[PDB]
């Protein structure tokens, strides 16, 4: 029943070492979900991360210690009720926030159950979850990047040619006075 010192120390050390190397830690209220739901969510995560992401229920007193042993701050608010943790150790972390977001939606669960967490070392609130979940893909962002970098040149060319468009437009705004 009781654990040995050497057992209670490494359990904590393992969790702490993991948290020192995560690009994502998202705190969720998973109470009420079934073992089958846990299986399903884990299956979706594995589909994109292999063993690079995990989702599991962890005793609050354990989460509190591991988070402190690592060097997190302002996390105490995420541990007010029985909490499960979603974390990514390998791979880009945004896809996993997207996956648990959709999953909770697919189960008609209250999205506020998805409290914030930490994304690449930065704290994020429950209100920011959707924003992370709605981010476009890396490929899409790369495409968007091209236009944003070119904006100064596009803006110059549009501004100058606009001078000519002004004339074209005013003439139509008079012609169609029919």
């Amino acid at each position: 029943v009781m654990l040995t010192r050497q057992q209670k120390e490494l359990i904590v050390k393992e969790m702490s070492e993991i948290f020192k190397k995560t690009s994502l830690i998202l705190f969720a209220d998973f109470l009420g979900f079934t073992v089958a739901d846990l299986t399903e969510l884990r299956s979706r995560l594995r589909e994109k991360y292999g063993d690079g992401a995990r989702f599991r229920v962890v005793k609050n007193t354990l989460l509190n210690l591991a988070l402190k042993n690592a060097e997190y701050e302002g996390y105490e608010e995420f541990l007010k009720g029985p909490t499960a943790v979603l974390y990514v150790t390998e791979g880009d972390p945004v896809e996993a926030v997207k996956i648990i977001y959709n999953f909770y939606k697919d189960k008609k669960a209250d999205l506020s159950r998805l409290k914030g967490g930490f994304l690449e070392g930065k704290k994020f609130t429950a209100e920011e979850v959707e924003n992370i979940a709605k981010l476009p893909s890396k490929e899409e962002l790369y495409a968007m990047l091209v236009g944003r970098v070119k904006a100064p040149i596009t803006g110059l060319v549009f501004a100058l040619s606009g001078i000519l468009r002004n004339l074209v437009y005013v003439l139509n705004a008079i012609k169609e006075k029919k």
């Binding site: 880009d92 992370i132 890396k138 962002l141 944003r148 904006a151 100064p152 803006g155």
Partner: peptide
């Protein structure tokens, strides 16, 4: 920084980092 050095720093950005970059560039330029 050269055109190539900037391109190398860009491709090492995470998805989240790219989104931050795209937005700041959106606000600065036009």
């Amino acid at each position: 920084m050269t055109i190539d050095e900037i391109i190398e720093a860009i491709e090492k950005l995470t998805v989240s980092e790219l989104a931050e970059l795209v937005k700041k560039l959106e606000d600065k330029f036009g």
